[PDB]
Amino acid sequence: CPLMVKVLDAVRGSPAINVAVHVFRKAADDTWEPFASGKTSESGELHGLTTEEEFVEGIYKVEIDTKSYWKALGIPPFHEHAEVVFTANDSGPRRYTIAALLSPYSYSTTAVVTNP
Amino acid sequence: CPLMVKVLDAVRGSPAINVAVHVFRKAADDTWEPFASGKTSESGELHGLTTEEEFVEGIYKVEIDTKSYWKALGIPPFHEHAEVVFTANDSGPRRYTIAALLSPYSYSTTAVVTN
Amino acid sequence: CPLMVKVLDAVRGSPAINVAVHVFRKAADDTWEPFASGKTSESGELHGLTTEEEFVEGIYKVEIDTKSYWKALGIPPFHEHAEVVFTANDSGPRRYTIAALLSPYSYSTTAVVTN
Amino acid sequence: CPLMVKVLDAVRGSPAINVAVHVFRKAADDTWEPFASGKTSESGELHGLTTEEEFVEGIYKVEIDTKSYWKALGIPPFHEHAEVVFTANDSGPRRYTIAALLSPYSYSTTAVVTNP
Ligand SMILES: [Cl-]
Ligand SMILES: [Cl-]
Ligand code: NA
Ligand code: NA
C-alpha cells in the first residue's frame, strides 16, 4: 500500500464516508491520465489504490469530490473538489498518506510520508 | 493595535461575528489574570484590546468562545473554546494577529507576528 | 476588488510574500483558459486580478505556486502547488477572498464570500 | 480505548514523535485536575490514556507540549502548547480521537467522535 487517502468531516467530527476520489498521473504530453479511483470507506479511508510496482516516480493528482459529499448532506459548499498535486520521489522506502479535513468553505490537506 | 484577533467561519465562508474573546496574562503567582476582552465585529475582527504601554512581556492566553458562537447558530460543536497560549514581547515589542478558522468539530489558529 | 488572494506562512508566522498565483476559467470546450495572474505583495495579498465586468459566472481555478515559494526559502515541500477550484457568481456577483495557510507538507484554504 | 490523541508534524510530513501530552479533568472547584498523560509513539499516537469506567461525563483538557517539540527540532515556535477543551457526553457509545496538526506558528485540531 504505497498510497492511501484519508478524509475527515469537520462539521460532524467523523470520517467522510463514500467520498469519491480520483487519482491521475501526469503524462509526457502534460495531460492528466486516470491512474486509480475509489470511494472512502466507513473509516474515511481509501486503501488499495495502487501497488509499489505501478507507483513509479512522477507527478500525481488526487481529486477528492467534496462538492458531491456536501450536497448529499444538504450543506452549500464552496469548492468543486479538493485537488492535491505532488511529485512521488524514490528517496528510499516510502508510504504516502494524503489526508484531507473538510469544511463547506475550507479544507486542509496534509501529506504523511513514512519509511516502512 | 499590538494585539488583534480575527475569526472566520468555515461553514458559512464568512467572518465569525460577535464571538466573545477573553485575554489573560500569567501572573508572578502562576495564575491567569484577566487582561482584556471584547467581541468580534462584522468583519470578524477585534481591535483595541490593549496598548503598547500595557502589553508588556509575558505569557498570554487568548480564549475564543467558540461553543457559544456555534450554539447561537444552532450547530452542535465539540470544543468549549479555542485557547491560544503564547509568550509575547520577549525579544522586544511586536504586533500580533491571532487568527482562528472555525468549524463545529475542528479549528485552526495561526499567529502573524510583525516587528 | 471582486477576487483577492491572501497567503500566510505557518512556519514563519508571516505573510507569504512574492508567491505566484495563476487563475484560470473553464471554457465551453471544458479546457482551463488563462484568466489572470500575479504575485503576492509584502502583506501576502494579491489585489487587482480582475474587474466586476470581466469576472462573470463560471468555474475558476486559483493555482498558488507553493513549491517555488518553499524552495526559495530552502525548505523541501511536498506539493507542486495548491489548487482552489470553485464556481463563482452563479447567484449573481459576489466578492471572493481566497485565503491559504502554508506549511511545507500541508496547507489549508478558505474562501470568504461577501455580497 | 475511549480517548486517543494523534499528532502530526506539517513541516516534516510525519507523525510528531515523543510529544508530551497531559490530560486534565475539571473539578467541582473549577480547577484542572491531572487525569492522564503520556508521550506520542513512533506513529504520533497516544493510546491507553484512560478506561471506559474512568472516562465519565465532564469537561476535559488535552495539553499538547508543542513548544518543547519544536525547540528540539531547532525551529522557533509561537505557542507554549496546544490546548483542546471539550465536554465528554454519553450520547450512546463513543470513542474520541483528538487529532492535532502542528506547524511552528499555527496548529489545527479536530475531534473524530465515533460509535464503536
Ligand atoms: Cl490591541
Ligand atoms: Cl480582483
Ligand atoms: Na495503495
Ligand atoms: Na483511552
Author numbering:
A (entry chain A), D (entry chain A): 10 to 125
B (entry chain B), C (entry chain B): 10 to 124
From the reporting publication:
Transthyretin (TTR)3 is a 55-kDa protein that aggregates into amyloid fibrils under pathological conditions. In its native tetrameric conformation, TTR transports retinol-binding protein and thyroxine (T4) in the blood and cerebrospinal fluid.
We chose the substitution to proline because it is known to inhibit fibril formation. None of the proline variants fully halted TTR aggregation, but substitutions S85P, E92P, and V94P and the S85P/E92P double substitution significantly decreased protein aggregation and altered aggregate morphology. Kelly and co-workers have also analyzed TTR by NMR studies and x-ray crystallography in neutral and acidic environments to assess structural changes. These studies have confirmed that the EF-loop undergoes large conformational changes when the pH is changed from neutral to an acidic environment. As additional evidence, we tested fibrillization of the segments 91AEVVFT96 and 119TAVVTN124 in isolation as well as their mutated versions to find that the substitution of residue 85, 92, 94, 119, or 121 did hinder self-association and fibril formation.
